């Protein structure tokens, strides 16, 4: 009859503890495991996969056109798109990365943005993708933009351009929830030259943009999302 002393917290139910418990079905034999392709071990495995960004946020209702970035021929010096780098909000909120990032509180790492050209093969263009670190306003023109991290894209056989957004930060982790101190800067696109279409061709050409995380990435402090809720319990 071993003397003990019970401590504060005795009897509490902390949803996050991890202990042993008796099995309600003692002696039970689970079905044997069979091989199944596509095993997921860590969420960091799947955010490395790029998914489309609904950059054409313009409109009222969701529609396949949200993923299409319009490009215009014979335009020079002009801006193609702009956006803040709030992965837990704005255009990135619905993406797979932003979707999973919202289950965590902190994030850190480099980002990958690819732009895939879908215009005719007989067309040409030179675009400029830029990342403006925190500390200023979004660039107002290509001149301001090119002063930061950028990539000049030459449209050709190689259909996609990939630009990495290197972890540019003082503090080692930023919040996924949009917070001023932990902002990541801006992202913008402009014509370095201009889109040139061949004879017998007209209208708009579109760009498809993808977002994914680099191996650099980290996400901590698991929490509940704002991307799902309910007013009543569901039934069959």
């Amino acid at each position: 009859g071993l003397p003990t002393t019970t401590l504060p917290g005795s009897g509490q139910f902390l949803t996050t503890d991890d202990r042993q418990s008796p099995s309600a079905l003692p002696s039970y034999e689970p079905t044997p495991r069979i091989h199944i392709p596509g095993k997921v071990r860590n969420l960091l495995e799947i955010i490395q996969v790029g998914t489309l960004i609904p950059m054409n946020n313009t409109g009222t209702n969701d529609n396949v056109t949200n993923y299409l970035i319009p490009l215009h021929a014979d335009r020079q010096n002009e801006q193609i798109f702009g956006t803040k780098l709030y992965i837990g909000d704005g255009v990135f909120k619905t993406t797979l990365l932003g979707e999973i990032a919202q289950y965590y509180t902190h994030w850190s790492g480099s980002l990958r943005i690819s732009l895939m050209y879908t215009g005719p093969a007989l067309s040409s263009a030179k675009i400029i993708l830029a990342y403006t670190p925190p500390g200023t306003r979004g660039p107002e023109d290509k001149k301001e933009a090119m002063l930061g991290t950028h990539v000049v894209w030459d449209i050709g056989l190689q259909s996609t351009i990939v630009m990495t957004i290197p972890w540019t930060s003082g503090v080692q982790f930023r919040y996924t929830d949009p917070d001023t101190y932990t902002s990541a800067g801006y992202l913008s696109c402009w014509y370095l030259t201009s889109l040139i279409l061949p004879p017998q061709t007209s209208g708009q050409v579109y760009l498809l943009s993808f977002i994914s995380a680099c191996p650099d990435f980290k996400l901590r402090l698991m929490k509940d999302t704002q991307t799902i809720s309910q007013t009543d319990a569901l039934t069959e």
């Binding site: 392709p37 998914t51 993923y67 797979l96 056989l157």
Partner: protein, 255 residues
């Protein structure tokens, strides 16, 4: 001298060729293989018709219009009337297979448009009505025809929402599934090799579709001036490593 672009696939007595490929995807990095003894439950001997079923079958063609929403095929359903494969599929209680899916769309260096070709394991469709209404069997079993997403919705059928993947998820995230693009300026075709993916070693080929091939226009088709405003889309599919069991009398299905 060889290229990632020119390719030949010979399966049985059918050979496909493409001169404008963009590699090919082998789902979850796994190639099809037969069922092993360690994984097997059912004590019966499996039938392997080989080259008679493991050959390329070409589905009825589709027409890519500039207003097209997309198309959806369910396997093994789409191949249920395809020669000896369909036969075997209805004489056995259980079957198992993988496929080689080859989607075709050729054009002109003056055209622009982009198709997303994706394979979705367990694509449980949402109903037109919502609520607790289920999508009737016949609507998920269209056969070769498949589900044409710009067709008017009927009671008890699926939604016609490409934007929502017909299941309540968003289109852009469809990239987490083995997919390939058909970007006219680049591509000509898309090839995807699909291994058997299921929670059971073998299954019923009629009451359960393991995957649904989805071809969805993302970038609208834009033809050159004076050119025909449409392009056909052809889907060729070859079962690979097919096995059948529980042979008996012909399975009886609704219709």
């Amino acid at each position: 001298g060889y290229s990632d672009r020119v390719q030949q696939i010979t399966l049985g007595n059918s050979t496909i060729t493409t001169q404008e490929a963009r590699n090919a995807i082998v789902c979850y990095a796994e190639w099809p293989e037969y069922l092993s003894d360690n994984d097997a439950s059912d004590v019966n001997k499996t039938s392997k018709p080989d080259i008679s079923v493991c050959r390329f079958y070409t589905l009825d063609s589709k027409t890519w219009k500039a207003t097209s929403k997309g198309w959806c095929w369910k396997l093994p359903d789409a191949l249920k009337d395809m020669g000896v494969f369909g036969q075997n599929m209805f004489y056995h209680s259980l079957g198992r297979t993988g496929y080689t899916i080859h989607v075709q769309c050729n054009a002109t260096k003056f055209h622009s448009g982009c198709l997303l070709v994706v394979v979705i394991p367990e694509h449980q469709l949402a109903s037109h009505e919502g609520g607790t209404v289920s999508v009737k069997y016949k609507y998920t079993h269209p056969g070769d025809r498949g589900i044409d997403l710009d067709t008017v919705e009927v009671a008890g059928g699926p939604t016609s929402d490409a934007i929502y993947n017909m299941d309540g998820t968003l289109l852009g995230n469809l990239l987490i599934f083995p997919h390939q693009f058909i970007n006219m300026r680049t591509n000509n075709t898309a090839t995807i090799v699909v291994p058997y993916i299921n929670s059971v070693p073998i299954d019923s080929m009629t009451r359960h579709n393991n995957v649904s091939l989805m071809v969805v226009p993302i970038a609208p088709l834009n033809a050159p001036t004076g050119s025909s405003p449409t392009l056909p889309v052809t889907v060729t599919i070859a079962p690979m490593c097919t096995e059948f069991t529980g042979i008996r009398s012909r399975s009886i299905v609704p219709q």
